[PDB]
Amino acid sequence: SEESQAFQRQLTALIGYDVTDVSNVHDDELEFTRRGLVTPRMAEVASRDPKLYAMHPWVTSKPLPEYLWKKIANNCIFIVIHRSTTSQTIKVSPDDTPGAIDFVLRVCGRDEYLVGETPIKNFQWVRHCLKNGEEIHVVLDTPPDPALDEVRKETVSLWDCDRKFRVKIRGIDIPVLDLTVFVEANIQHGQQVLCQRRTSPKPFTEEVLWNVWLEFSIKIKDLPKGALLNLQIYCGKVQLLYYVNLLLIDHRFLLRRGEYVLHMWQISSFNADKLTSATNPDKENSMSISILLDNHPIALPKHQEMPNQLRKQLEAIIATDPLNPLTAEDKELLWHFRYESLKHPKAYPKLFSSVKWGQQEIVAKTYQLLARREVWDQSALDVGLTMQLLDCNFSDENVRAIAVQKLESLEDDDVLHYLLQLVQAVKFEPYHDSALARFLLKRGLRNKRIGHFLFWFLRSEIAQSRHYQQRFAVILEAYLRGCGTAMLHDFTQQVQVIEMLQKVTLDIKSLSAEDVSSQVISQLKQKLENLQNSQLPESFRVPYDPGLKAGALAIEKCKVMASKKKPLWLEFKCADPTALSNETIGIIFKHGDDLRQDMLILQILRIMESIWETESLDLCLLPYGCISTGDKIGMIEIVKDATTIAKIQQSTVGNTGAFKDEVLNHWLKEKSPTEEKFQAAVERFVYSCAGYCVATFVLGIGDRHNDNIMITETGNLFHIDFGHIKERVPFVLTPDFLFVMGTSGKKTSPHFQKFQDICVKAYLALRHHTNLLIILFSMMLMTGMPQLTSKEDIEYIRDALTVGKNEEDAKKYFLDQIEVCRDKGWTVQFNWFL
Numbered sequence: 008s009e010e011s012q013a014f015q016r017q018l019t020a021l022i023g024y025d026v027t028d029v030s031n032v033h034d035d036e037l038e039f040t041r042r043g044l045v046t047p048r049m050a051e052v053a054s055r056d057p058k059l060y061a062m063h064p065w066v067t068s069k070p071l072p073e074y075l076w077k078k079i080a081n082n083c084i085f086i087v088i089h090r091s092t093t094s095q096t097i098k099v100s101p102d103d104t105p106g107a108i109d110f111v112l113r114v115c116g117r118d119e120y121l122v123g124e125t126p127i128k129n130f131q132w133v134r135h136c137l138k139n140g141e142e143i144h145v146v147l148d149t150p151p152d153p154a155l156d157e158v159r160k161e162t163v164s165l166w167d168c169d170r171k172f173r174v175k176i177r178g179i180d181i182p183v184l185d186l187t188v189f190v191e192a193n194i195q196h197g198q199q200v201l202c203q204r205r206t207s208p209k210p211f212t213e214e215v216l217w218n219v220w221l222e223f224s225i226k227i228k229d230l231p232k233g234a235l236l237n238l239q240i241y242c243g244k245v246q247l248l249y250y251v252n253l254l255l256i257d258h259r260f261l262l263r264r265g266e267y268v269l270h271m272w273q274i275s276s277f278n279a280d281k282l283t284s285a286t287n288p289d290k291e292n293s294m295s296i297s298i299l300l301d302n303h304p305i306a307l308p309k310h311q312e313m314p315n316q317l318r319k320q321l322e323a324i325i326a327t328d329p330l331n332p333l334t335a336e337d338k339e340l341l342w343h344f345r346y347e348s349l350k351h352p353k354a355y356p357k358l359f360s361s362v363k364w365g366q367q368e369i370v371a372k373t374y375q376l377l378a379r380r381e382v383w384d385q386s387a388l389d390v391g392l393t394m395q396l397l398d399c400n401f402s403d404e405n406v407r408a409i410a411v412q413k414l415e416s417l418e419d420d421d422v423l424h425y426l427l428q429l430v431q432a433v434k435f436e437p438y439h440d441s442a443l444a445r446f447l448l449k450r451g452l453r454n455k456r457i458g459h460f461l462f463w464f465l466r467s468e469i470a471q472s473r474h475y476q477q478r479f480a481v482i483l484e485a486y487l488r489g490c491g492t493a494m495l496h497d498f499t500q501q502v503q504v505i506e507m508l509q510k511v512t513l514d515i516k517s518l519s520a521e522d523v524s525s526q527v528i529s530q531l532k533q534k535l536e537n538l539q540n541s542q543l544p545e546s547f548r549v550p551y552d553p554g555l556k557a558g559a560l561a562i563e564k565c566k567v568m569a570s571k572k573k574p575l576w577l578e579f580k581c582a583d584p585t586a587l588s589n590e591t592i593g594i595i596f597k598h599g600d601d602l603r604q605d606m607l608i609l610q611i612l613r614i615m616e617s618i619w620e621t622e623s624l625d626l627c628l629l630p631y632g633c634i635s636t637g638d639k640i641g642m643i644e645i646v647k648d649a650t651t652i653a654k655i656q657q658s659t660v661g662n663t664g665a666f667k668d669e670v671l672n673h674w675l676k677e678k679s680p681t682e683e684k685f686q687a688a689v690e691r692f693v694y695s696c697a698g699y700c701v702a703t704f705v706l707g708i709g710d711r712h713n714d715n716i717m718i719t720e721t722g723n724l725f726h727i728d729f730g731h732i733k734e735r736v737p738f739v740l741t742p743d744f745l746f747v748m749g750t751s752g753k754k755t756s757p758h759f760q761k762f763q764d765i766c767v768k769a770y771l772a773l774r775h776h777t778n779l780l781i782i783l784f785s786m787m788l789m790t791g792m793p794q795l796t797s798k799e800d801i802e803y804i805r806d807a808l809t810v811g812k813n814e815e816d817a818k819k820y821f822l823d824q825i826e827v828c829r830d831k832g833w834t835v836q837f838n839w840f841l
């Protein structure tokens with residue numbers, strides 16, 4: 008039809024990629040995945056309560072922390088319900104379910120609802136108000152129409168083959184380039200290379216032919232599902248220059264066969280891009296390789312105590328961190344005591360790394376082993392452990408599926424906490440259709456807030472990653488076909504706004520030399536007025552805060568920043584008349600940088616906060632909204648009432664940097680209305696500073712120049728610009744920070760004794776989740792930093808978290824770091840200014 012044609016055109020423009028396109032395939036996996044995702048979409052759509060879907064209550068079933076209880080007025084919270092101009096105020100108790108006080112309670116100025124069978128202490132908006140110490144303002148409203156969510160009507164056994172595996176390398180071709188070059192062919196399973204063959208070296212001409220069979224030692228019957236033929240091109244120590252990958256057992260369990268011309272990826276170690284089954288879309292410029300797979304259709308089938316010192320050796324092995332390398336001795340031990348090891352969920356990652364995946368009978372015993380998993384199925388969810396099983400070390404669908412099984416029990420509050428890393432982990436899936444892809448699909452469709460962030464996270468990777476754009480596009484399409492017309496319209500509006508603003512960023516960045524022109528400010532405001540009538544939708548959801556709807560631009564307040572990437576400083580009015588403010592919505596619109604590294608670090612900061620909540624600590628971090636939106640384009644939340652530490656020094660002192668200890672402290676008092684609020688500022692500063700000292704040490708991003716650090720007018724310290732990373736320093740504890748606490752060079756202050764108190768406790772709390780943080784750190788580097796990441800980069804966090812050390816000793820180690828910062832004073836800060 009035509010209605011079912013212009014709708015795909017709509018899907019395409021929302022997705023940023025054409026999913027029906029077959030210009031860059033060599034089998035039908037992508038198309039097979041589209042048809043396969045119809046079923047899980049349908050089930051989730053059909054079983055979601057239409058009413059609860061449309062109001063999307065954002066709820067938690069976690070306990071209310073000790074830091075929030077001490078801020079109640081003894082078992083009583085205040086809720087202001089609203090008329091038109093006036094308002095009524097109700098006395099409430101934390102257990103009063105929405106219905107205890109048709110009509111619905113919508114938060115003033117936000118598409119956020121207080122509805123459903125949960126106590127009001129179990130709402131995030133309520134806990135937000137309580138955290139910042141603000142009154143809850145709501146409106147008696149009409150529930151939205153679920154009709155707006157309406158969804159438009161949518162043979163030889165392999166184990167019977169003793170032949171050794173063989174692949175014919177016909178040769179390579181490249182339109183443009185000289186030394187010597189050879190092709191390496193690896194049977195891979197995860198990062199585990201099972202068998203390796205090389206060709207003879209040949210001269211590197213624009214076309215090089217071999218026509219040789221490479222006979223491997225692995226038999227066909229021993230090929231596991233998810234095994235990759237990985238083809239690499241080395242020039243000559245040698246050097247890797249091109250790689251492509253091909254699945255040996257395709258999506259139907261059929262062995263791969265016939266002719267292949269694969270266009271290959273260029274090189275700029277452990278990196279997610281290296282594992283992709285996607286071929287290079289750049290048909291014109293990219294190197295290709297011509298191969299022949301030949302062996303009748305062959306299909307893989309599906310299937311239907313110990314001594315003292317050894318138990319101890321095994322337990323020591325199970326105890327070690329996820330980055331502790333297993334020796335052959337350890338693996339052989341784990342596998343032999345297979346069934347003892349299965350009694351310990353913590354042993355699953357190491358045990359499944361003890362499996363000889365290239366030996367058919369071993370795999371069979373491994374699948375037998377998984378069939379007997381009462382203990383695994385019974386234990387409480389550990390995200391750490393579960394994440395470990397989704398990383399690049401595991402390619403077995405069954406192994407990976409028992410990880411996804413655990414995630415299924417995750418409450419929506421926590422999916423949101425791990426969504427970004429979960430979406431990144433799709434890049435570790437051998438096949439386009441995986442249990443994890445389906446999990447993300449149905450959790451997103453069950454919940455408008457997960458689905459909103461799912462959209463952007465997926466879209467972020469489609470726009471700037473060729474290596475996985477096809478896979479993420481299919482999954483995104485499957486999502487959009489279930490999210491419902493009311494969300495398709497939001498997405499459409501958001502896409503239009505950022506596409507429009509992009510154009511304005513482009514032409515403006517070119518009109519400036521490498522400060523800021525005066526004409527240019529008027530030139531920007533000129534084009535922004537041009538938009539306000541043009542075709543700009545006069546209300547769109549804020550990508551990083553889907554509660555807020557933005558309306559008209561506040562043109563007068565809009566400017567180009569003094570940064571040499573010339574980002575746009577934009578302000579918007581809230582489209583909601585029910586808003587009881589006036590404060591504009593401030594968004595930084597940036598080109599030049601890829602915001603994905605920033606997204607990752609910030610999300611990890613959030614994870615660190617929720618970690619700290621389990622131990623009733625609130626280190627007042629400020630992880631501001633930051634959404635990559637397109638290719639090298641995104642938005643950043645403007646934090647109100649904030650300035651950079653550096654600018655505070657350029658206000659009292661001046662240019663070069665004769666830094667003074669007092670300058671921060673009396674900046675605080677001049678922005679403090681009273682002594683009452685000034686102390687709360689010093690209070691907020693002690694916590695903030697403690698959070699960012701700990702967080703950044705662990706992540707190894709603590710040494711920042713002080714224009715990249717900010718403070719709010721109420722004490723809240725917070726770091727910025729994470730997407731960038733001699734004598735070193737563990738973090739930033741400069742004298743101006745230290746004097747706010749009341750110390751100079753070598754002393755101890757009451758507020759400082761608190762800083763040391765909170766850090767030590769925050770640090771040790773993180774250490775109780777060593778495994779989880781190690782795994783998120785590993786995954787971050789492998790999927791987020793195109794840094795050809797090494798073990799040594801990863802095994803930094805082993806140092807930072809003082810693995811294998813007692814608590815006493817870990818307290819000492821960090822306290823040394825504090826003292827290291829003291830010794831340097833201003834040496835590192837001045838050193839940047841070269």
Ligand SMILES: O=S(=O)(Nc1cc(-c2ccc3nccc(N4CCOCC4)c3c2)cnc1Cl)c1ccc(F)cc1
Binds near residue numbers: 570643650728
């Ligand atoms: O504008 S940027 O190009 N990008 C960017 C901005 C922010 C950010 C987030 C929230 C903010 N809230 C309030 C005020 C901000 N300002 C930043 C400094 O200039 C004054 C205004 C905020 C900035 C965070 N991360 C990045 Cl990558 C940039 C600018 C200066 C820097 F030193 C490095 C980066």
